[PDB]
Structure formats: C-alpha cells, structure tokens
PDB file of C-alpha atoms in Angstrom:
ATOM      1  CA  UNK R   1      12.570  10.986  34.052  1.00 35.97           C
ATOM      2  CA  UNK R   2      14.086   7.513  33.392  1.00 34.17           C
ATOM      3  CA  UNK R   3      10.584   6.013  33.525  1.00 36.25           C
ATOM      4  CA  UNK R   4      11.533   2.294  33.150  1.00 34.68           C
ATOM      5  CA  UNK R   5       7.934   1.097  32.414  1.00 33.71           C
ATOM      6  CA  UNK R   6       6.674   3.767  29.994  1.00 32.34           C
ATOM      7  CA  UNK R   7       8.684   2.724  26.953  1.00 32.50           C
ATOM      8  CA  UNK R   8       7.208   1.659  23.593  1.00 33.40           C
ATOM      9  CA  UNK R   9       9.050  -1.151  21.746  1.00 31.87           C
ATOM     10  CA  UNK R  10      12.191  -0.031  19.898  1.00 30.83           C
ATOM     11  CA  UNK R  11      10.834  -1.702  16.763  1.00 33.08           C
ATOM     12  CA  UNK R  12       7.597   0.284  16.762  1.00 34.12           C
ATOM     13  CA  UNK R  13       9.194   3.594  17.789  1.00 33.75           C
ATOM     14  CA  UNK R  14      11.929   3.293  15.135  1.00 33.04           C
ATOM     15  CA  UNK R  15       9.454   2.348  12.418  1.00 31.99           C
ATOM     16  CA  UNK R  16       7.220   5.362  13.183  1.00 30.19           C
ATOM     17  CA  UNK R  17      10.235   7.730  13.123  1.00 29.61           C
ATOM     18  CA  UNK R  18      11.636   6.102   9.927  1.00 31.67           C
ATOM     19  CA  UNK R  19       8.320   6.552   8.134  1.00 36.66           C
ATOM     20  CA  UNK R  20       8.226  10.229   9.173  1.00 36.37           C
ATOM     21  CA  UNK R  21      11.747  10.814   7.783  1.00 37.93           C
ATOM     22  CA  UNK R  22      10.964   8.772   4.653  1.00 34.47           C
ATOM     23  CA  UNK R  23       8.015  11.018   3.836  1.00 31.99           C
ATOM     24  CA  UNK R  24      10.003  14.212   4.511  1.00 30.81           C
ATOM     25  CA  UNK R  25      13.444  13.371   3.100  1.00 27.85           C
ATOM     26  CA  UNK R  26      13.057  10.215   0.967  1.00 28.11           C
ATOM     27  CA  UNK R  27      14.679   6.762   1.326  1.00 27.25           C
ATOM     28  CA  UNK R  28      18.224   8.235   1.057  1.00 27.94           C
ATOM     29  CA  UNK R  29      17.453  10.372   4.134  1.00 28.54           C
ATOM     30  CA  UNK R  30      16.968   7.144   6.114  1.00 28.60           C
ATOM     31  CA  UNK R  31      19.655   6.145   8.547  1.00 34.98           C
ATOM     32  CA  UNK R  32      19.225   3.441  11.174  1.00 36.47           C
ATOM     33  CA  UNK R  33      22.055   4.934  13.187  1.00 34.35           C
ATOM     34  CA  UNK R  34      20.486   8.400  13.123  1.00 33.04           C
ATOM     35  CA  UNK R  35      16.993   7.111  13.945  1.00 30.86           C
ATOM     36  CA  UNK R  36      18.330   5.182  16.916  1.00 26.52           C
ATOM     37  CA  UNK R  37      20.050   8.290  18.378  1.00 27.86           C
ATOM     38  CA  UNK R  38      16.949  10.392  17.659  1.00 29.04           C
ATOM     39  CA  UNK R  39      14.907   7.867  19.720  1.00 32.09           C
ATOM     40  CA  UNK R  40      17.268   8.429  22.687  1.00 33.75           C
ATOM     41  CA  UNK R  41      22.834   0.616  22.659  1.00 30.51           C
ATOM     42  CA  UNK R  42      20.240  -1.495  20.724  1.00 30.64           C
ATOM     43  CA  UNK R  43      18.831  -0.230  17.389  1.00 31.40           C
ATOM     44  CA  UNK R  44      16.578  -3.353  17.385  1.00 30.16           C
ATOM     45  CA  UNK R  45      17.062  -3.942  13.652  1.00 29.88           C
ATOM     46  CA  UNK R  46      20.114  -5.971  12.599  1.00 32.49           C
ATOM     47  CA  UNK R  47      20.938  -3.501   9.789  1.00 33.35           C
ATOM     48  CA  UNK R  48      19.456  -0.874   7.491  1.00 30.93           C
ATOM     49  CA  UNK R  49      18.041  -3.506   5.148  1.00 32.66           C
ATOM     50  CA  UNK R  50      16.062  -5.105   8.016  1.00 34.90           C
ATOM     51  CA  UNK R  51      14.537  -1.665   8.714  1.00 37.46           C
ATOM     52  CA  UNK R  52      13.597  -1.104   5.036  1.00 42.75           C
ATOM     53  CA  UNK R  53      12.119  -4.615   4.730  1.00 41.93           C
ATOM     54  CA  UNK R  54      10.024  -3.901   7.879  1.00 42.52           C
ATOM     55  CA  UNK R  55       8.752  -0.564   6.463  1.00 39.53           C
ATOM     56  CA  UNK R  56       7.915  -2.198   3.134  1.00 37.22           C
ATOM     57  CA  UNK R  57       6.123  -5.138   4.834  1.00 37.89           C
ATOM     58  CA  UNK R  58       4.197  -2.765   7.096  1.00 39.90           C
ATOM     59  CA  UNK R  59       3.230  -0.683   4.044  1.00 39.62           C
ATOM     60  CA  UNK R  60       1.667  -3.642   2.269  1.00 39.51           C
ATOM     61  CA  UNK R  61      -0.077  -4.831   5.446  1.00 37.31           C
ATOM     62  CA  UNK R  62      -1.595  -1.358   5.820  1.00 40.15           C
ATOM     63  CA  UNK R  63      -2.556  -1.152   2.141  1.00 42.04           C
ATOM     64  CA  UNK R  64      -4.361  -4.489   2.435  1.00 41.49           C
ATOM     65  CA  UNK R  65      -6.082  -3.222   5.616  1.00 39.24           C
ATOM     66  CA  UNK R  66      -7.224  -0.068   3.723  1.00 38.97           C
ATOM     67  CA  UNK R  67      -8.633  -2.044   0.784  1.00 36.14           C
ATOM     68  CA  UNK R  68     -10.515  -4.416   3.178  1.00 38.24           C
ATOM     69  CA  UNK R  69     -12.059  -1.421   4.988  1.00 39.02           C
ATOM     70  CA  UNK R  70     -13.079   0.084   1.669  1.00 39.35           C
ATOM     71  CA  UNK R  71     -14.904  -3.162   0.826  1.00 41.24           C
ATOM     72  CA  UNK R  72     -16.586  -3.255   4.288  1.00 41.60           C
ATOM     73  CA  UNK R  73     -17.723   0.402   3.966  1.00 41.55           C
ATOM     74  CA  UNK R  74     -19.283  -0.138   0.526  1.00 39.08           C
ATOM     75  CA  UNK R  75     -22.456  -1.853  -0.582  1.00 38.21           C
ATOM     76  CA  UNK R  76     -22.323  -5.635  -1.088  1.00 35.32           C
ATOM     77  CA  UNK R  77     -22.447  -5.617  -4.845  1.00 33.95           C
ATOM     78  CA  UNK R  78     -19.536  -5.874  -7.297  1.00 36.41           C
ATOM     79  CA  UNK R  79     -19.894  -2.487  -9.012  1.00 39.29           C
ATOM     80  CA  UNK R  80     -19.730  -0.714  -5.605  1.00 39.53           C
ATOM     81  CA  UNK R  81     -16.779  -2.808  -4.430  1.00 38.03           C
ATOM     82  CA  UNK R  82     -14.776  -2.158  -7.616  1.00 39.76           C
ATOM     83  CA  UNK R  83     -15.420   1.566  -7.238  1.00 42.40           C
ATOM     84  CA  UNK R  84     -14.507   1.534  -3.524  1.00 41.41           C
ATOM     85  CA  UNK R  85     -11.258  -0.395  -4.050  1.00 41.73           C
ATOM     86  CA  UNK R  86     -10.113   2.011  -6.771  1.00 43.48           C
ATOM     87  CA  UNK R  87     -10.790   5.138  -4.728  1.00 43.69           C
ATOM     88  CA  UNK R  88      -9.104   3.587  -1.660  1.00 42.57           C
ATOM     89  CA  UNK R  89      -6.014   2.613  -3.647  1.00 45.37           C
ATOM     90  CA  UNK R  90      -5.511   6.095  -5.122  1.00 46.56           C
ATOM     91  CA  UNK R  91      -6.071   7.754  -1.712  1.00 46.99           C
ATOM     92  CA  UNK R  92      -3.530   5.421  -0.108  1.00 48.93           C
ATOM     93  CA  UNK R  93      -0.954   6.103  -2.818  1.00 45.03           C
ATOM     94  CA  UNK R  94      -1.327   9.874  -2.543  1.00 44.58           C
ATOM     95  CA  UNK R  95      -1.224   9.828   1.268  1.00 45.13           C
ATOM     96  CA  UNK R  96       1.877   7.598   1.397  1.00 43.07           C
ATOM     97  CA  UNK R  97       3.917   8.514  -1.676  1.00 42.24           C
ATOM     98  CA  UNK R  98       7.454   7.773  -0.400  1.00 43.01           C
ATOM     99  CA  UNK R  99       6.289   4.647   1.484  1.00 46.59           C
ATOM    100  CA  UNK R 100       4.575   3.322  -1.629  1.00 47.44           C
ATOM    101  CA  UNK R 101       7.739   3.895  -3.750  1.00 47.61           C
ATOM    102  CA  UNK R 102       9.707   1.979  -1.078  1.00 48.81           C
ATOM    103  CA  UNK R 103       7.102  -0.832  -0.968  1.00 48.24           C
ATOM    104  CA  UNK R 104       7.300  -1.448  -4.725  1.00 50.33           C
ATOM    105  CA  UNK R 105      11.082  -0.886  -5.041  1.00 47.66           C
ATOM    106  CA  UNK R 106      11.817  -3.241  -2.160  1.00 46.59           C
ATOM    107  CA  UNK R 107       9.342  -5.958  -3.199  1.00 44.64           C
ATOM    108  CA  UNK R 108      10.893  -6.272  -6.673  1.00 41.47           C
ATOM    109  CA  UNK R 109      14.598  -5.837  -5.800  1.00 43.04           C
ATOM    110  CA  UNK R 110      16.953  -8.820  -6.380  1.00 44.55           C
ATOM    111  CA  UNK R 111      16.715 -11.063  -3.300  1.00 47.02           C
ATOM    112  CA  UNK R 112      13.639  -9.319  -1.830  1.00 47.23           C
ATOM    113  CA  UNK R 113      12.624 -10.686   1.576  1.00 46.73           C
ATOM    114  CA  UNK R 114       9.888 -13.353   1.478  1.00 48.64           C
ATOM    115  CA  UNK R 115       7.764 -11.585   4.128  1.00 47.79           C
ATOM    116  CA  UNK R 116       7.684  -8.462   1.914  1.00 49.60           C
ATOM    117  CA  UNK R 117       6.867 -10.564  -1.180  1.00 48.80           C
ATOM    118  CA  UNK R 118       4.031 -12.366   0.734  1.00 51.12           C
ATOM    119  CA  UNK R 119       2.563  -9.126   2.109  1.00 54.33           C
ATOM    120  CA  UNK R 120       2.518  -7.606  -1.445  1.00 56.27           C
ATOM    121  CA  UNK R 121       0.788 -10.688  -2.858  1.00 58.51           C
ATOM    122  CA  UNK R 122      -1.951 -10.366  -0.191  1.00 55.80           C
ATOM    123  CA  UNK R 123      -3.078  -6.920  -1.420  1.00 53.93           C
ATOM    124  CA  UNK R 124      -3.354  -8.353  -4.943  1.00 52.85           C
ATOM    125  CA  UNK R 125      -5.105 -11.595  -3.782  1.00 50.74           C
ATOM    126  CA  UNK R 126      -7.801  -9.453  -2.136  1.00 50.90           C
ATOM    127  CA  UNK R 127      -8.496  -7.754  -5.477  1.00 50.40           C
ATOM    128  CA  UNK R 128      -8.414 -11.057  -7.433  1.00 49.27           C
ATOM    129  CA  UNK R 129     -10.976 -12.552  -4.947  1.00 48.41           C
ATOM    130  CA  UNK R 130     -13.357  -9.566  -5.402  1.00 51.82           C
ATOM    131  CA  UNK R 131     -13.116  -9.980  -9.231  1.00 51.59           C
ATOM    132  CA  UNK R 132     -13.660 -13.794  -8.922  1.00 53.61           C
ATOM    133  CA  UNK R 133     -16.704 -13.200  -6.669  1.00 54.72           C
ATOM    134  CA  UNK R 134     -18.011 -10.722  -9.260  1.00 54.82           C
ATOM    135  CA  UNK R 135     -17.709 -13.378 -11.941  1.00 52.50           C
ATOM    136  CA  UNK R 136     -19.495 -15.915  -9.688  1.00 53.81           C
ATOM    137  CA  UNK R 137     -22.298 -13.431  -9.037  1.00 58.22           C
ATOM    138  CA  UNK R 138     -22.523 -13.109 -12.850  1.00 57.92           C
ATOM    139  CA  UNK R 139     -22.013  -9.310 -12.789  1.00 55.93           C
ATOM    140  CA  UNK R 140     -19.046  -9.419 -15.143  1.00 56.43           C
ATOM    141  CA  UNK R 141     -18.020 -11.629 -18.076  1.00 57.43           C
ATOM    142  CA  UNK R 142     -15.615 -14.616 -18.183  1.00 56.91           C
ATOM    143  CA  UNK R 143     -11.850 -14.365 -18.105  1.00 55.75           C
ATOM    144  CA  UNK R 144      -8.690 -14.728 -16.068  1.00 56.15           C
ATOM    145  CA  UNK R 145      -9.461 -12.854 -12.870  1.00 57.55           C
ATOM    146  CA  UNK R 146      -5.755 -12.165 -12.240  1.00 58.29           C
ATOM    147  CA  UNK R 147      -5.365 -10.423 -15.632  1.00 56.29           C
ATOM    148  CA  UNK R 148      -8.567  -8.434 -14.901  1.00 55.05           C
ATOM    149  CA  UNK R 149      -7.179  -7.453 -11.508  1.00 52.02           C
ATOM    150  CA  UNK R 150      -3.847  -6.556 -13.146  1.00 53.14           C
ATOM    151  CA  UNK R 151      -5.502  -4.213 -15.669  1.00 53.26           C
ATOM    152  CA  UNK R 152      -7.336  -2.553 -12.747  1.00 52.85           C
ATOM    153  CA  UNK R 153      -4.066  -2.135 -10.783  1.00 51.73           C
ATOM    154  CA  UNK R 154      -2.285  -0.607 -13.806  1.00 56.27           C
ATOM    155  CA  UNK R 155      -5.213   1.739 -14.352  1.00 53.81           C
ATOM    156  CA  UNK R 156      -5.376   3.081 -10.800  1.00 51.78           C
ATOM    157  CA  UNK R 157      -1.635   3.022 -10.186  1.00 54.90           C
ATOM    158  CA  UNK R 158      -1.406   4.961 -13.491  1.00 57.24           C
ATOM    159  CA  UNK R 159      -3.876   7.565 -12.155  1.00 57.15           C
ATOM    160  CA  UNK R 160      -1.942   7.875  -8.836  1.00 53.17           C
ATOM    161  CA  UNK R 161       1.330   8.187 -10.823  1.00 54.38           C
ATOM    162  CA  UNK R 162      -0.108  10.963 -13.041  1.00 54.00           C
ATOM    163  CA  UNK R 163      -1.452  12.749  -9.967  1.00 55.75           C
ATOM    164  CA  UNK R 164       1.886  12.556  -8.114  1.00 57.55           C
ATOM    165  CA  UNK R 165       3.617  13.843 -11.264  1.00 59.11           C
ATOM    166  CA  UNK R 166       1.314  16.809 -11.819  1.00 62.24           C
ATOM    167  CA  UNK R 167       0.051  15.339 -15.108  1.00 63.07           C
ATOM    168  CA  UNK R 168      -3.725  15.545 -14.623  1.00 67.48           C
ATOM    169  CA  UNK R 169      -3.691  19.133 -15.938  1.00 68.69           C
ATOM    170  CA  UNK R 170      -6.369  20.354 -13.527  1.00 71.24           C
ATOM    171  CA  UNK R 171      -8.724  17.330 -13.772  1.00 74.33           C
ATOM    172  CA  UNK R 172      -9.707  16.550 -10.179  1.00 76.43           C
ATOM    173  CA  UNK R 173      -8.228  13.144  -9.275  1.00 76.74           C
ATOM    174  CA  UNK R 174     -11.589  11.964  -7.832  1.00 77.56           C
ATOM    175  CA  UNK R 175     -13.297  12.625 -11.222  1.00 78.06           C
ATOM    176  CA  UNK R 176     -10.582  10.762 -13.169  1.00 80.43           C
ATOM    177  CA  UNK R 177     -10.769   7.736 -10.819  1.00 81.44           C
ATOM    178  CA  UNK R 178     -14.587   7.646 -11.272  1.00 80.83           C
ATOM    179  CA  UNK R 179     -14.409   7.922 -15.056  1.00 77.75           C
ATOM    180  CA  UNK R 180     -11.795   5.127 -15.131  1.00 77.36           C
ATOM    181  CA  UNK R 181     -13.991   2.959 -12.805  1.00 74.06           C
ATOM    182  CA  UNK R 182     -17.147   3.446 -14.913  1.00 74.46           C
ATOM    183  CA  UNK R 183     -15.324   2.672 -18.164  1.00 73.56           C
ATOM    184  CA  UNK R 184     -13.601  -0.394 -16.635  1.00 72.56           C
ATOM    185  CA  UNK R 185     -16.920  -1.658 -15.203  1.00 69.84           C
ATOM    186  CA  UNK R 186     -18.656  -1.220 -18.593  1.00 68.56           C
ATOM    187  CA  UNK R 187     -15.815  -2.984 -20.423  1.00 70.73           C
ATOM    188  CA  UNK R 188     -16.160  -6.011 -18.140  1.00 73.25           C
ATOM    189  CA  UNK R 189     -19.911  -6.002 -17.412  1.00 74.11           C
ATOM    190  CA  UNK R 190     -22.384  -8.652 -18.616  1.00 75.45           C
TER     191      UNK R 190
END
C-alpha cells in the first residue's frame, strides 16, 4: 500500500529510471518531470541539468570501477593489464552506448560541472598510472605516459565507435581489440 518505510531514495530511483529511458530513447527522450511522475511533489534534482550531470558523473564512476576490476581480474604484469583494460573499455562502451555519449558530451560542454570533470579525469588517471607502472617495471620504453595513455584511449574508443557504427565489416570486435592491443604493446615494448 502506502508503505512509508519501503522507499528507495528519490535520487537513486530517478537515476535508474533515467538511465533506462536514456538507453531506449536517447538524451532527448529524458524529462525530469516525466521521470518524477513515472516514479509515483519532490523530483529531488533541482533541474534537468542536475539530473544529466548526475548521470554523467555516475557513468564515469562506473567506468572507473569497471577498469579497476579488469586490472584486479588480470595477471599482475603490464602486458596482461593493458590487454584487460582495453577489452573492459570496449565492453563498457558497447553495453552503455547512450550513457557513454552523455558522459563525453556533458564532460566537455561549456561550463561542465566540476564533479563530472573530476570523475572523467579519474578513469584516465587509472590508465596513466598503469602505463607509468609499466615504465617503472621496465616493460615498455620511455615517454610521456599521458600521451601513451591518450593513444590507447583513441585506439579503443575508435574500435568502440566503429563497432557502434557498423563499420567493422564482419570482423569480430574481440579480434580487432586483441590485434590493436598486440600491435600497441609491440610498438611500446622494450
């Protein structure tokens, strides 16, 4: 019935519903007013932009979480970690296509919220640290670890972009990720 003590927080409930609509209908199908009525006067969020910022922040937090798990799952050597991070990134991207578009669009919009910006920088910092550790272990050659990380990001975001766009022409995404990882590793390796 009423059930006054079996309610989730409005913030969490609205964010789960918003993400579901985002993935079905896209960002233009998102309405705070609709989501609030759908969740049966507070909408929690001050306005639509606060909702989008929250989704974007949550997206980065979850992407960072996924990369960290990939590292934990894999062997403790650089070649394995590089391979695991790449595969985890592409899987995330393909499982959360509309959220990922929102994450990147929001993060780089004029006046982007600092908590979104900080969350996005964390995912990248993780990668940069793994590259730096690889250089300290002497597995790869010298160079600016943030440029190395950036080339890796472009590579695997490029693969995810081709896959989402139907431009792999029948090459299984997993095989293209692996070929890109092997070639990258070889191009850096000592």
